[PDB]
Amino acid sequence: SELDQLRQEAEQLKNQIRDARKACADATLSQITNNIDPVGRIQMRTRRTLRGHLAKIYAMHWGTDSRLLVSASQDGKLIIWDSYTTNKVHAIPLRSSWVMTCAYAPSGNYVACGGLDNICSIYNLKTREGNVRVSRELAGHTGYLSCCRFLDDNQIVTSSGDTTCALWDIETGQQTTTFTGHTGDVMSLSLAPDTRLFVSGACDASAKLWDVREGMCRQTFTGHESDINAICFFPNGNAFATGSDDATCRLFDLRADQELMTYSHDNIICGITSVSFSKSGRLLLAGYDDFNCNVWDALKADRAGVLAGHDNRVSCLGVTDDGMAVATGSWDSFLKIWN
Amino acid sequence: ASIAQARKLVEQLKMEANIDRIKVSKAAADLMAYCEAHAKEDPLLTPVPASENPFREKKFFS
Amino acid sequence: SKKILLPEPSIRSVMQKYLEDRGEVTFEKIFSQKLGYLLFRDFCLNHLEEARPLVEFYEEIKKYEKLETEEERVARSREIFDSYIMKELLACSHPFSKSATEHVQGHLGKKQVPPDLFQPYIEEICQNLRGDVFQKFIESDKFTRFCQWKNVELNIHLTMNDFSVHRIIGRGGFGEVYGCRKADTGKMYAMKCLDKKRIKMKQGETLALNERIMLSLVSTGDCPFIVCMSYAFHTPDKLSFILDLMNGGDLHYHLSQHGVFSEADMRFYAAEIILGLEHMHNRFVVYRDLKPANILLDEHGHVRISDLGLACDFSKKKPHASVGTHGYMAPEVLQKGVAYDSSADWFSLGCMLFKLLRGHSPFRQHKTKDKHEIDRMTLTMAVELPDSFSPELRSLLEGLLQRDVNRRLGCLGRGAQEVKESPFFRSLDWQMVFLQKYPPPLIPPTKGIKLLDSDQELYRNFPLTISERWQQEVAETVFDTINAETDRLEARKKAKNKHEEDYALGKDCIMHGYMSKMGNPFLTQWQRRYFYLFPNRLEWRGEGEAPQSLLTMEEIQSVEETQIKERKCLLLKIRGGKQFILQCDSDPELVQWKKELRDAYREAQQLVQRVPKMKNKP
Ligand SMILES: CC1=C(C(=O)Nc2ccc3[nH]ncc3c2)[C@H](c2ccc(F)c(C(=O)NCc3nccc4ccccc34)c2)NC(=O)N1
Numbered sequence A: 001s002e003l004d005q006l007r008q009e010a011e012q013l014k015n016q017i018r019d020a021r022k023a024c025a026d027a028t029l030s031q032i033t034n035n036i037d038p039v040g041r042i043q044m045r046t047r048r049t050l051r052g053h054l055a056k057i058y059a060m061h062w063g064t065d066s067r068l069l070v071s072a073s074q075d076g077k078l079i080i081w082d083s084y085t086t087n088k089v090h091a092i093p094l095r096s097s098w099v100m101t102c103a104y105a106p107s108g109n110y111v112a113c114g115g116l117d118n119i120c121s122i123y124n125l126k127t128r129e130g131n132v133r134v135s136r137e138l139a140g141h142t143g144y145l146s147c148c149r150f151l152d153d154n155q156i157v158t159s160s161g162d163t164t165c166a167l168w169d170i171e172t173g174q175q176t177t178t179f180t181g182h183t184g185d186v187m188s189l190s191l192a193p194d195t196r197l198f199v200s201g202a203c204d205a206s207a208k209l210w211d212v213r214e215g216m217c218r219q220t221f222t223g224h225e226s227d228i229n230a231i232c233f234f235p236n237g238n239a240f241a242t243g244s245d246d247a248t249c250r251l252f253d254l255r256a257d258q259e260l261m262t263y264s265h266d267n268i269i270c271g272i273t274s275v276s277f278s279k280s281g282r283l284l285l286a287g288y289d290d291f292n293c294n295v296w297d298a299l300k301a302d303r304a305g306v307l308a309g310h311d312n313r314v315s316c317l318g319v320t321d322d323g324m325a326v327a328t329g330s331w332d333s334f335l336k337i338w339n
Numbered sequence B: 001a002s003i004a005q006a007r008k009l010v011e012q013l014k015m016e017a018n019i020d021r022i023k024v025s026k027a028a029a030d031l032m033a034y035c036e037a038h039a040k041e042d043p044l045l046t047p048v049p050a051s052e053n054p055f056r057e058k059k060f061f062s
Numbered sequence C: 001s002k003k004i005l006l007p008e009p010s011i012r013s014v015m016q017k018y019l020e021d022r023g024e025v026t027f028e029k030i031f032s033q034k035l036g037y038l039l040f041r042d043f044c045l046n047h048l049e050e051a052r053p054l055v056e057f058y059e060e061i062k063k064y065e066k067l068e069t070e071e072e073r074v075a076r077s078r079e080i081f082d083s084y085i086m087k088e089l090l091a092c093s094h095p096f097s098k099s100a101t102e103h104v105q106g107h108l109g110k111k112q113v114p115p116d117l118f119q120p121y122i123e124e125i126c127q128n129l130r131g132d133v134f135q136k137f138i139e140s141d142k143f144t145r146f147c148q149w150k151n152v153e154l155n156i157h158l159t160m161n162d163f164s165v166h167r168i169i170g171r172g173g174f175g176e177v178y179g180c181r182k183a184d185t186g187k188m189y190a191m192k193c194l195d196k197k198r199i200k201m202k203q204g205e206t207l208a209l210n211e212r213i214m215l216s217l218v219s220t221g222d223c224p225f226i227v228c229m230s231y232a233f234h235t236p237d238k239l240s241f242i243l244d245l246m247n248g249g250d251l252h253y254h255l256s257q258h259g260v261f262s263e264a265d266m267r268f269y270a271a272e273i274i275l276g277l278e279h280m281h282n283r284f285v286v287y288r289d290l291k292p293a294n295i296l297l298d299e300h301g302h303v304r305i306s307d308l309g310l311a312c313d314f315s316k317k318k319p320h321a322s323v324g325t326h327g328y329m330a331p332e333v334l335q336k337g338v339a340y341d342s343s344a345d346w347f348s349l350g351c352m353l354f355k356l357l358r359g360h361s362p363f364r365q366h367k368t369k370d371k372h373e374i375d376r377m378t379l380t381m382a383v384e385l386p387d388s389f390s391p392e393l394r395s396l397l398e399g400l401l402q403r404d405v406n407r408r409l410g411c412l413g414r415g416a417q418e419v420k421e422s423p424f425f426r427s428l429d430w431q432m433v434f435l436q437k438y439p440p441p442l443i444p445p446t447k448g449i450k451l452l453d454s455d456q457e458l459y460r461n462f463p464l465t466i467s468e469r470w471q472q473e474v475a476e477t478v479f480d481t482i483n484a485e486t487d488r489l490e491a492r493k494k495a496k497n498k499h500e501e502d503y504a505l506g507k508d509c510i511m512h513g514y515m516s517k518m519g520n521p522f523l524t525q526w527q528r529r530y531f532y533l534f535p536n537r538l539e540w541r542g543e544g545e546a547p548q549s550l551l552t553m554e555e556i557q558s559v560e561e562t563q564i565k566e567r568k569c570l571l572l573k574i575r576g577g578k579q580f581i582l583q584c585d586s587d588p589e590l591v592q593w594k595k596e597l598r599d600a601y602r603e604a605q606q607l608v609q610r611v612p613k614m615k616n617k618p
């Protein structure tokens, strides 16, 4: 019958695609880097604290100027902070309480946010009277907005519990492209640096690679045992790390189409919530659910450092485009900055 | 359930199968490469002292 | 202290949900309440030119139904027609069905003006006022004022301390009645105080709990001829009724002082009493105790029926028991297992009236103080009547004192209407009887018993307020005044903040309003904060500050009603064994916050649970 051949074919295609990869497994990344010098211990200290959110922090994002960032909280607000000075440039009260994500358009001029409202809302940062108007409410998704990132001031890519991601013309609020493919709520997404690709991690325990302009999935990496809460590109654009509920991080190379390295220990059982590389990509920072960020050596995979500080889950983090600092939000209602 | 679904999936898997892969060792090498090439310009790795670091003991900002 | 203070308009957020919860915000429900009507009316006439003329008309129509004559009517009906129907037809802004408009036009030119001439118009005005005009009224702040008065009403708890009590003006086995002013609004009332102790010792818990239920049945409708109830309440030793004030004393006393009454004088009392019965009888209540001591005078001489302890409700099951005063009870009353309805009062009306003409009950002869003597004389003996009586007076008494129900005037299928058209009353015009226009004939001037909490349960659902009464009491005294004084006290503060921005707008806020959380109980610390309930969090603030604290729905484990200083509070149990307590400024606030916080956290907790990023992972 018709399906049973198509099911037959998909099975014997996955088997084929498995072997294609096993054919490139001549070496481990571990072997290949067995020769280089450790990074030693990385001690980072808390240069700033950002207090102001009245409840859990769920997400944050640096402005490209490595100075400003936006946070989003259970307290139904976006704050934009001057990280240098702890100065709330804007508090922004939202229209739904249930926010989950936020983004800072690379230009400085808009921020976006969204959550269980199922809408991405663009806030304009200086209008006529330099007030903070809402500019659009990109409605179209049929599930909670889980992450979103601006390409520029006119386009934005979102991800959702409706198992899809999507591309939007901000100007007309049009859902330009949609990326079906995932079979589980989509959780984090990350834009390639050239911005013609992006990856997404989801609850089906897979990450996918997508072509912005073609609207198709190029590749699918698997092998996490559980939900994938977060994801981030290696700065060169060829590999990305994912963090899972299964207590590991994993580096995947695009070009070898596979996993390269697993970051984990027996001591660690708590799930991962966010990831980000340092500038050179040598350091993989991951936020865990035991209130620590662990710092990892990407190339060797030994735990090089810990950013202990917060008293509850670390919900989110990021490194600044210039490489100076790491930000970290938590359920304890603070952000903290670290060199 | 649906015929056109099974079809679209297979087309995907074909797409995914026909890409040019590369030896793990090559890609791994290329990463390590990048990581050296820029360890010079990465403040979390090579500690750049307080004068250039906007956070440490500073207070002079726009 | 002792006058009414209205809550602040902030109260609108809370009450409006409290009422929406009860289908209480219809046009239909608000229009039918005195205070509602009043506020609604202000709105239309003064604030909304689109509907002014619609109500003006409604009222000009209203007054026309009170007009006494057909020459006063045809005169008015032209003016009304000319002024509110006609002129609008000529400019084509008369939005009413032509079946309604010609139903009127037809009768005017054919000179037939019953008081129900404009009845299809009322109807249609109400259709026009419902919903759309009604909408702008909810949005209007007259509806703010409505919620304010409504909050007061729904928070009425009375004690003996809300009235100044005066002279004792009533006595019975089980308590006494005092006259009194209600400080609140200045109104004079009677206060009946039954003592529970005297009740238990004499076993009369039923025959007192009854008196209340009965007063409920009757006290709507504003009867000029019954002693009605505006409130009941209690304290531990006493039950208490607030009743219409009658300080003329009863007929049983006035009989002795005046001696017998003429027919003409007696006619008056009988007239009022009838109407009094009528009212009761339409509400399916037999009085039963009807006699001179149960009829009181006011200061002017007009009378009313009082003490409805023996009155019962035949609306469901008719009575068979021999319960009334010996000498006035009918035949069918006397024989046990023999049922009876309203029929019974008419016989007693009979006997009572003999008594006002004659000195004694018809059956109480030989000064007999023995009961079984009358028992039997009433059932057996047909009744003989002084030939000093006029014959139409006979015609009446004969009809009333019929031992056969099927032959008794009052009982023959039209209730009271028959009695009124006895030839004894041919000289009277009952519209005038009912407006009390006829001049009245007479114008006046130890225990060792214990009380178990098993007995306070007996008197549990006793406290009561008749809303229609309260709103009237208010309407006719302080309502206009208090609205003014408030209008000023609010207009100060709004003009003055010029802090204007409103924090709940533009958001997903469920509800907001005042409450006082508890700090350190040992310091009787209650901070009074403004709260905002959002679907996931409960924020609150003090002054000159947006909310700087909060409590999240997901950390709340249970919400319970708990008394602290017997002053009922909300106790929230928090996740980390912690506790959070709130006192709100009125019964209905509590009820609503308890509902909404309960619904809020129940949902949020269940929704969060289904989101990986927000859910917990034990
Ligand atoms: C009309 C009336 C009485 C009376 O005066 N009642 C009264 C009521 C309303 C008023 N408004 N303004 C004045 C005024 C007066 C008086 C009276 C005044 C106060 C009382 F407590 C009782 C009384 O207790 N009656 C007996 C009784 N009352 C209630 C429940 C009972 C239950 C069992 C047995 C007897 C019961 C009786 N004696 C009486 O024969 N009839």
Ligand SMILES: [Mg+2]
Residues within 6 Å of the ligand: C319, C320, C321, C322, C331, C332, C333, C334, C335, C336, C337, C338, C339, C340
């Ligand atoms: Mg009987």
